[PDB]
Symmetry: D3
Subunit: 162 residues, 6 copies
């Protein structure tokens, strides 16, 4: 019994940089999406993609611990993540930049209310990482870890706009 | 600075099952390639792909610690890996099945003769895993680890046949 | 004049197996679609794809003689069929499994009410086969033949749910 | 057990027209390939593709019952067939124009020296039709049928030039 | 700074012919789109694509200076253009036929209301040419030139039907 | 009699920057190819791609007026150009950066020994631009324009190495 997942798109990832620290971001629609705490109170953030840094404006901060950043007009990503129409939360693919490295792993996952729990392969920083279904559609945004157990908040289309 | 690698193909992976345990294999040409110790003394091995188990026969065991298995005629993989023409060994993407999970990570790497060394994300079983360049072409086959340092044997087209 | 049709996807086909016999099914959305009489009054059916058998649960049986089956979670089809936006019923592509063989043919067609009619090269059972337009989008689900004339029930996005 | 074949390219087919009759041709490289008897002693043939007729010139008639026609400069086919690297002759996909209609079917096959034999769905002529492996690569050129048994001549890359 | 634009699709272009002259058309959905004045009062126009001429019937003439022609059933284009969801008008890619030849150029554009202004690379007939965003989605339909300054009418999904 | 060309890849273009001025470059294999005079006597040139400038080293200067630059290890282009196997010099596609803009055009071409002549759409510098066949494979490297007449030197696989 193995997790044979599909449409894994590491090119949909970027690195978010702020004075306070760094996180993982991901392209979806016209947005860059990340964890709220990566952005904090900042109105603008630095975005790193394929070795070039951009300045980007924070668009929307809902009540959920997610942040929406307007993708810079000159940043043309090779891949973007779509949301799931028929979400199966039973297994996931997690993609992240951890320090200098890409880290991708599959895991089985469990739901608690608005939250998802799953195993991760590093204890280092994964904040903002997209948690995708077996078909590569984003289900959730990685928030935190306790040891090798990860936790994410579920995202849905209604989160994008007030 | 981050390792933003390309043409990462987890669909080119399979699991090799023997009475001694399990390893990772990968599709290349008409073969399934793995580490010699994954095959052991089993002329016939089990191959698991997309949830279906196949019996497959070892084709060739060169001097290098690598094994070539004939891909079953009814096994139609969605992806295969090609070897590099102009190999850059400075950085790598390693893709493996670790227990039930896909684990993919990038790393800086170093060459010591026929051996490639690189940081790994698990101490667990990565035997047979393809070690690819930044463009997703196979450079080497993962053999062993000492802690979080992995070691692989470099592969070239002349290794495929006697 | 020849029917030069496009986007023909045999990977979107599977075989449905019941105690009463076999038929063709096709992947569309998160469903496997077939003719109602292939399923009958069975609540569960067997689905065969790329050499693996799965048990699958019948989801929905509308007034039309079409059956919707929930695609098993572990079955990841390489292709799915989409419905036509602006249907041209003047000609078709029919794809089916007949015993061990894939069979694809084009034909002139005529629509009348909810039935689509077209010549079939063979009198073999094609129950549940997708009947596609010239661009590979599904127009109808093949029902029966009399004897060299096929009959299919036209399919609509509203047919998927009550 | 079913023949679940891949990379089936009906857009790689055309129709060859002569005073003596019509046949199937297929694009490979810069050529259109057909059976030697579809061309006969003609130096120029008519080629029909996507509704447009072209005049084309016969390039090469080797000893094998196969004919090579230079593809007209203004005919830009949407698909071409490649030859097999590691040819499996045990099963096939046959693609043909039969009158106005595309006909595609799979079958088990067997080699007899230079000849490949296989079941055909129709007793209608399919002269010049490509006989492909399970991966859509061309193995042979259909020559004749006797009842429901088709016969083809195996093709080499060496057959393309003297 | 350079305009590095994407998804440029010349196969989505055709040439429209009337007794009064010629213009550029483009495929979108089931239609061919062009400038209203290319069509004029004609109910049928001639369409040229990949070397074959077709007769095509004008479908709908909205208040905007845009013409919608029903794509001939036997005309199967290799590419079609989609409209943008969140249109960025700041830079464009213009694709047209000028006499026998394809001409593609980028420009910065100004929005204004229902009209779009940009630099063009020729003073010749570009009437009906698609004006695309940096991602190859149609924003507008080219109308006229005053020197090397082009003007276009913005296209909207609601323009397709009354 | 329009030119309907294919596989146009503007993503395979870059800009070469030197103290003496600028040119167009194109990705092929592991190289960036341009006109010899773009590079001149420089050992290192600057390369601009998707908004990021890199330093690159000149690999090889053959007797032909063509220059080979090693692609920077951190520059990962989205497209590369291949050479043609059966070169048709009758017509071409020329792709270039002209100041800030991308310019793409087709034209009939004229052969004089190892050189090619064709119409171009600008009088501004295009030095180093790829001259492609109707299928988007590179035939020649653009050298200079005199007025709206472009001149290029034909390239073959042996030019890449001494
Ligand atoms: Cl498995
Ligand atoms: Cl899975
Ligand atoms: Cl950063
Ligand atoms: Cl699951
Ligand atoms: Cl970075
Ligand atoms: Cl990198
Ligand atoms: Cl297993
Ligand atoms: Cl590196
Ligand atoms: Cl025809
Ligand atoms: Cl047709
Ligand atoms: Cl398919
Ligand atoms: Cl079955
Ligand atoms: Cl029709
Ligand atoms: Cl089966
Ligand atoms: Cl098979
Ligand atoms: Cl095709
Ligand atoms: Cl014909
Ligand atoms: Cl077989
Ligand atoms: Cl630039
Ligand atoms: Cl841009
Ligand atoms: Cl195109
Ligand atoms: Cl014309
Ligand atoms: Cl812009
Ligand atoms: Cl034309
Ligand atoms: Cl042409
Ligand atoms: Cl491109
Ligand atoms: Cl620059
Ligand atoms: Cl030409």
């Amino acid at each position: 019994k193995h997790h044979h997942h599909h449409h894994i798109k590491p090119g949909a990832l970027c690195v978010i940089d702020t004075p306070e620290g760094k996180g993982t971001g991901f392209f979806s629609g016209n947005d860059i999406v990340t964890a709220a705490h990566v952005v904090g109170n900042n109105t603008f953030v630095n975005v790193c993609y394929e070795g070039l840094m951009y300045e980007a404006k924070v668009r929307y901060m809902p009540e959920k611990d997610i942040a929406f950043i307007t993708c810079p007009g000159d940043l043309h990503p090779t891949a973007r993540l779509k949301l799931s129409k028929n979400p199966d939360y039973s297994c996931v693919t997690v993609m992240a930049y951890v320090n200098e490295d890409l880290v991708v792993s599959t895991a089985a996952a469990m739901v608690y209310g608005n939250t998802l729990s799953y195993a991760v392969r590093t204890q280092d920083g994964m904040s903002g990482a997209p948690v995708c279904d077996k078909y590569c559609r984003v289900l959730a945004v990685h928030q935190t870890n306790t040891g090798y157990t990860g936790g994410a908040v579920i995202i849905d289309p209604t989160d994008f706009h007030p």
